[PDB]
């Protein structure tokens, strides 16, 4: 079981409407666990998972201070980038960052992340070697040469290999149980027809966590990849997810098709068919 601790940060300039909007969201194994939002009179880092309420006021105070420090730095960065791209001060612009660490089941670093984007596009990223940067355009080359000269990469490598890992281990101790939770899908097949010689069988999976799941339809042995309609997995809004997969089949041949639901909360994959009770 590998694990990760990552922070997703957003700064959006709002010329004429106030100060930039600033957001930090922290994730342990892709599960949101803290959040800072600048849109408040006294913005504070907040717990987003009940197992984080164990942390004392010192922790929260320090996180809040850092967030406020990052907010100011991003306010400067937004201005710098207007210059690099020679853009007007009247436009809204976005800087995004993904920063953090994933470690193996042994607790050691597998990957360090530090990726920046400007207006939804790659700007600059720390390579997997944790020593060099990839710049995506001419503007990012300025940042790159600056950071190389000042040896920023090695300072950042230290944080990622040390502090990041250490905090991840701490957060896992308090939240591991919660993070390992699984809700298995309840599945069923619905049947739809307009006045025509075909029908639609829709295989549904509901109330499941985590989001990762696979649905297939089988005719005979073979899976029907090309013919299926699929929707993206989506939140029910209560912490669980939904998905469905559907196939158009000949009228009267419903019982030749089988739906399969694969999910880690299932001891064995579910198999099911259209089943009219009357």
């Amino acid at each position: 079981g590998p694990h990760s601790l990552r922070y997703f940060v957003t700064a959006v300039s709002r010329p004429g409407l106030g100060e930039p909007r600033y957001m930090e969201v922290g994730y342990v194994d892709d599960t949101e666990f803290v959040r800072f939002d600048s849109d408040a009179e006294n913005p504070r880092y907040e717990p987003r998972a009940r197992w984080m309420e164990q942390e004392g006021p010192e922790y929260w105070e320090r996180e809040t201070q850092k967030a406020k420090g990052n907010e100011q730095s991003f306010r400067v960065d937004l201005r710098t980038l207007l210059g690099y791209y020679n853009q007007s001060k009247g436009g809204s612009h976005t800087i995004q960052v993904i920063s953090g660490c994933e470690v193996g089941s042994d607790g050691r670093l597998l990957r360090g992340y530090q990726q920046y984007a400007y207006d939804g596009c790659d700007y600059i990223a720390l390579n997997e070697d944790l020593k060099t940067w990839t710049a995506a355009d001419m503007a990012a080359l300025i940042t790159k040469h600056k950071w190389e000269q000042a040896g920023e990469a090695e300072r950042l490598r230290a944080y990622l290999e040390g502090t990041c890992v250490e905090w991840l281990r701490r957060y896992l101790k308090n939240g591991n149980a919660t993070l390992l939770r699984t809700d298995s899908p309840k599945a069923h097949v619905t049947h739809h027809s307009r006045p025509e010689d075909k029908v639609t069988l829709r295989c549904w999976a509901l109330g499941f966590y985590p989001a990762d799941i696979t649905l297939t339809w089988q005719l005979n042995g073979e899976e029907l990849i090309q013919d299926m309609e699929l929707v993206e997995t989506r939140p029910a809004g209560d912490g669980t997810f939904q998905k469905w997969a559907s196939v158009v089949v000949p009228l009267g041949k419903e019982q030749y098709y089988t739906c399969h639901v694969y999910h880690q909360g299932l001891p064995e994959p579910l198999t099911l068919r259209w089943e009219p009770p009357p």
Partner: peptide
């Protein structure tokens, strides 16, 4: 640990 103090772009 967020953390703070990233270098300027």
């Amino acid at each position: 640990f967020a953390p703070g103090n990233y270098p300027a772009l």
